[PDB]
Amino acid sequence: SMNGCDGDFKTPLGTVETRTMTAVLSPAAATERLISAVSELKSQPPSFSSGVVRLQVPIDQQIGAIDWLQAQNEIQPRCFFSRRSDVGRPDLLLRNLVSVAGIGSAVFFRDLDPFSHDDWRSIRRFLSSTSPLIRAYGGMRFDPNGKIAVEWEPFGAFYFSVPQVEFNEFGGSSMLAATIAWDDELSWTLENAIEALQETMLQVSSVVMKLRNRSLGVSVLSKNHVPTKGAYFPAVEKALEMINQKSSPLNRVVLARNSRIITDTDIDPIAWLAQLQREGHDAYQFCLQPPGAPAFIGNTPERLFQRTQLGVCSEALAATRPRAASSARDMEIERDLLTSPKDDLEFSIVRENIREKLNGICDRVVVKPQKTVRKLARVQHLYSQLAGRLTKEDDEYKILAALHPTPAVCGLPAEEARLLIKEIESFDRGMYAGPIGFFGGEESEFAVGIRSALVEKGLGALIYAGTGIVAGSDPSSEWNELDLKISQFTKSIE
Numbered sequence: 456s457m458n459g460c461d462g463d464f465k466t467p468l469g470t471v472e473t474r475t476m477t478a479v480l481s482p483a484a485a486t487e488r489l490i491s492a493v494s495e496l497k498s499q500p501p502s503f504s505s506g507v508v509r510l511q512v513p514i515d516q517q518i519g520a521i522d523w524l525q526a527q528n529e530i531q532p533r534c535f536f537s538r539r540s541d542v543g544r545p546d547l548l549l550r551n552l553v554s555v556a557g558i559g560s561a562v563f564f565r566d567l568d569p570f571s572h573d574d575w576r577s578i579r580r581f582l583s584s585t586s587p588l589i590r591a592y593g594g595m596r597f598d599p600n601g602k603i604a605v606e607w608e609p610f611g612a613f614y615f616s617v618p619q620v621e622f623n624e625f626g627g628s629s630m631l632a633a634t635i636a637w638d639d640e641l642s643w644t645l646e647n648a649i650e651a652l653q654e655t656m657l658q659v660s661s662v663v664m665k666l667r668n669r670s671l672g673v674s675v676l677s678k679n680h681v682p683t684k685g686a687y688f689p690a691v692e693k694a695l696e697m698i699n700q701k702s703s704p705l706n707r708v709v710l711a712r713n714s715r716i717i718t719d720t721d722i723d724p725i726a727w728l729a730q731l732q733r734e735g736h737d738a739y740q741f742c743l744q745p746p747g748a749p750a751f752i753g754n755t756p757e758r759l760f761q762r763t764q765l766g767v768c769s770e771a772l773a774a775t776r777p778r779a780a781s782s783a784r785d786m787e788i789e790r791d792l793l794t795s796p797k798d799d800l801e802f803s804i805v806r807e808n809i810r811e812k813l814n815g816i817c818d819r820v821v822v823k824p825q826k827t828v829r830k831l832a833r834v835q836h837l838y839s840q841l842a843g844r845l846t847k848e849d850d851e852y853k854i855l856a857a858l859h860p861t862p863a864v865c866g867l868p869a870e871e872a873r874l875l876i877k878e879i880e881s882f883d884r885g886m887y888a889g890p891i892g893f894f895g896g897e898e899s900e901f902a903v904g905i906r907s908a909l910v911e912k913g914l915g916a917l918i919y920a921g922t923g924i925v926a927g928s929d930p931s932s933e934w935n936e937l938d939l940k941i942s943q944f945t946k947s948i949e
């Protein structure tokens with residue numbers, strides 16, 4: 456492929472365009488038609504020295520993109536993204552893509568230095584408002600300046616890729632597409648790109664079975680936490696002392712834990728993700744797997760931001776407690792969250808911090824509601840949605856730079872929290888708690904990569920969770936909350 460960060464981002468490509476083929480009825484017909492479309496483009500090619508051409512075949516039936524991905528062999532990078540259903544919540548912003556899977560890379564974007572405005576421009580060079588489905592999928596580290604552990608090395612400070620071949624699932628139809636990207640200046644010619652794509656295209660499977668089998672066929676040989684329970688309790692106690700004493704200004708810090716599971720045979724990360732998705736309720740599913748890397752997968756309820764043209768929306772959370780099996784106990788916990796003066800204060804500092812980040816960029820900011828409880832599968836928490844209108848679509852970068860990370864994964868004051876996290880946690884978060892999603896021409900969306908796992912061949916998996924530590928947090932309750940938060944992974948691996 457080619458690293459678009461190496462490109463001359465101040466010079467536009469020769470073309471960015473999408474060509475749509477005649478619709479077919481089946482995935483097998485789409486695969487054969489796309490092979491022919493690539494061959495036709497090779498025979499009558501664009502003559503620019505750089506460009507992106509997306510070829511897409513509509514499929515007249517609804518097919519799960521995760522089912523397509525499971526049928527593909529290990530052509531990397533592997534990407535998956537499925538946005539939240541957003542059931543019942545209002546759209547503050549006032550053909551919807553249900554899920555997308557990708558294999559290979561038409562162009563990728565990676566550096567060891569933190570994602571910068573120039574890197575964003577490098578990606579924007581390959582996108583266009585008139586090609587709304589040309590999208591770069593990937594994510595960024597929680598802390599791009601932290602020491603990168605071996606398991607996270609392939610991801611760099613950030614990793615994004617436009618797939619070589621992708622499958623799009625819509626409401627009542629689907630699409631198979633291939634993207635040809637090239638830049639002679641980066642020594643990745645149109646000829647190079649078509650040759651690589653034709654080789655991948657002949658490998659693409661159309662045997663898109665609807666996978667429903669819940670057995671993952673692996674045995675867990677051990678489970679160990681970092682920090683251990685014995686080290687976690689003094690860590691939380693250290694944060695509580697900083698909060699309540701007057702030497703430190705700390706008010707909130709998110710402390711995380713890496714739960715390592717060793718398995719006898721390799722976990723299939725796509726099959727695992729598919730199990731979470733079938734149960735996922737109002738959540739983002741994702742997979743990011745650079746070449747030769749472990750697969751970063753997750754099923755997260757939390758949005759960093761969504762942009763549709765000039766509208767951006769985000770959200771705020773704080774004050775988490777369990778769900779309860781009994782309806783009366785569940786309601787009592789929720790009422791305690793909604794009425795507690797202390798929880799109200801702790802939620803407000805998160806909500807108002809995110810609000811003012813948006814307010815510095817957007818003319819108007821709307822908050823709705825000021826405070827509710829969002830009920831997740833195993834926990835519930837105070838919640839608010841926030842939205843604003845940009846003055847121009849190019850302010851997308853400012854939104855991303857302002858929001859990541861929020862106090863929902865870092866803390867307040869941000870710098871005192873960031874250094875406590877550096878000091879207390881012995882493991883690399885990598886892209887856990889970092890933005891994960893996609894850039895597109897007129898639309899971009901990023902989840903927060905919590906509720907996630909790094910799935911490594913010949914090892915097992917690293918499963919991540921964290922909680923917000925504030926005045927009065929109870930270490931035993933917080934530890935239990937970490938267990939609740941990873942249980943979608945630990946229950947399904949059995």
Ligand SMILES: [Mg+2]
Binds near residue numbers: 925
């Ligand atoms: Mg908490």
